[PDB]
């Protein structure tokens, strides 16, 4: 059970479970596929008053059209992003057309894949949420340590995933036609607050980004500023 490559008496790779176990342990991240484009949000945890706000960004863009966030082991996340960054930019130079989100995941899945094959390497310790647009719409997926990922209507990992899960559940049915680009944000703003109630004694800072041909204009922009505020307040009222 102690090495990364090996299998258990009935086909099981334990190192990957623990990988998963560490992914949960970290902060909580989410994402939502709406009308056209997507919306992400994470949970920066203010551990002291000596932290400059609006600063240590956990969300990162890829190319100029892909949002991206995760949780678990922070440096692991960062690392993975780089590879994704090359692959993208290489492809782009090659085919000219900005990279299809559908395949992108694989490129990454395939890379996270490998780190489950050899014993000399350590499994990727992060679950990753992301999405973007293209010609045939916006997409959103979520990659785990096992390397297995898929397309979701909205995703979640880290500490309290259920909170946001059952929360994401509702939205589906009342808005079975994709939630408004705008409302998407402010709604995400809330779904976070609700899920934070574990680090409750410890204050925090919410970060949000999104994509949309109508709002962002095909791009990925950081939800900061005015829309950002009201989106909070919006959450702050339902916060009762």
């Amino acid at each position: 059970d102690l090495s990364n490559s090996v299998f258990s008496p009935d086909g099981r790779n334990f190192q990957v479970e623990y990988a998963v176990k560490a992914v949960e342990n970290g902060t909580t991240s989410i994402g939502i596929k709406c009308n056209d484009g997507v919306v992400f949000a994470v949970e920066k945890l203010i551990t002291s008053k000596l932290l400059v706000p609006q600063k240590n960004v956990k969300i990162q863009v890829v190319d100029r059209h892909i949002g991206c966030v995760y949780s678990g082991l922070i440096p692991d996340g960062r690392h993975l992003v780089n590879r994704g960054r090359e692959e993208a930019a290489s492809f782009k130079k090659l085919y000219k057309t900005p990279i299809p989100i559908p395949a992108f995941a694989d490129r990454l899945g395939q890379y996270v894949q490998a780190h489950t094959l050899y014993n000399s390497v350590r499994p990727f310790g992060v679950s990753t949420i992301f999405g973007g647009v293209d010609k045939n719409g916006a997409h959103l997926y979520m990659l785990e340590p096992s390397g297995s990922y898929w397309g979701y209507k909205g995703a979640a990992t880290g500490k309290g995933r259920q909170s946001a899960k059952a929360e994401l559940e509702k939205l589906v049915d009342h808005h079975p036609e994709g939630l408004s680009a705008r409302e998407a944000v402010k709604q995400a703003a809330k779904i976070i607050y609700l899920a934070h109630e574990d680090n409750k004694e410890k204050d925090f800072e919410l970060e949000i980004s999104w994509c949309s041909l109508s709002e962002t204009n095909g791009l990925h922009k950081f939800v900061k500023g005015d829309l950002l505020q009201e989106a909070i307040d919006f959450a702050q009222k339902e916060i009762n």
Binding site: D1, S8, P9, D10, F14, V20, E144, S146, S148
Partner: protein
């Protein structure tokens, strides 16, 4: 296979955390019953330490204590055997994986196990309390030290109560703690939600 699961089912279905929660809770306040069985034997060693000599005939207040103590060992042991029952019923299929949960179960069993053993080296001392005195009260025909040995066989047995009681409290409290921490692992020892890889 249809019938087979039903048994394993209706069995685990008649005992649970719901049941065990009451032993921890029950044996929580019930320590008072021991913090008492203590102070009683104490007040008593003073009368024996100082209630100079006699001409014999079985002390009524002493048996009142051993009866009260042997009485307690009984309760506890049954109460423990109940917790033990709740766990043995949750021991998963034997194999060489996920043994993290299983391990907890075993470790806790060994401590509970100990508790029960403790209640059995003294949970009989009444039929033994008056077991050395028939030999002691005999030889009724006199060592002036034999008279004093009767003074002692009374006080000695009162000390054993106070002491067994003292340790006992500790054992119980330890067990309370131990359960309260693990427990969930005790009932749910394998998860198996790890099929997120297939």
């Amino acid at each position: 296979a249809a019938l087979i699961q039903n048994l394993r089912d209706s069995y685990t279905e008649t005992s649970s955390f719901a049941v065990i929660e009451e032993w921890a809770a029950g044996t929580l306040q019930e320590i008072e019953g021991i913090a008492k069985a203590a102070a009683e034997a104490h007040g008593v060693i003073r009368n024996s330490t100082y209630g100079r000599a006699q001409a014999e005939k079985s002390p009524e207040q002493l048996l009142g204590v051993l009866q009260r103590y042997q009485d307690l060992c009984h309760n506890v042991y049954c109460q423990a055997e109940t917790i033990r029952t709740v766990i043995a019923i949750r021991i998963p299929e034997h194999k060489e994986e996920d043994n993290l949960g299983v391990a907890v179960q075993h470790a806790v069993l060994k401590i509970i196990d100990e508790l029960e053993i403790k209640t059995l080296g003294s949970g009989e001392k009444s039929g033994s309390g008056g077991a050395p005195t028939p030999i002691g009260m005999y030889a009724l025909r006199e060592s002036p030290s034999l008279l004093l040995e009767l003074r002692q066989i009374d006080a000695d047995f009162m000390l054993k109560v106070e002491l067994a009681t003292t340790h006992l409290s500790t054992m119980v409290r330890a067990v309370i703690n131990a359960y309260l921490l693990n427990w969930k692992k005790l009932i749910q020892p394998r998860t198996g939600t790890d099929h997120m890889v297939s």
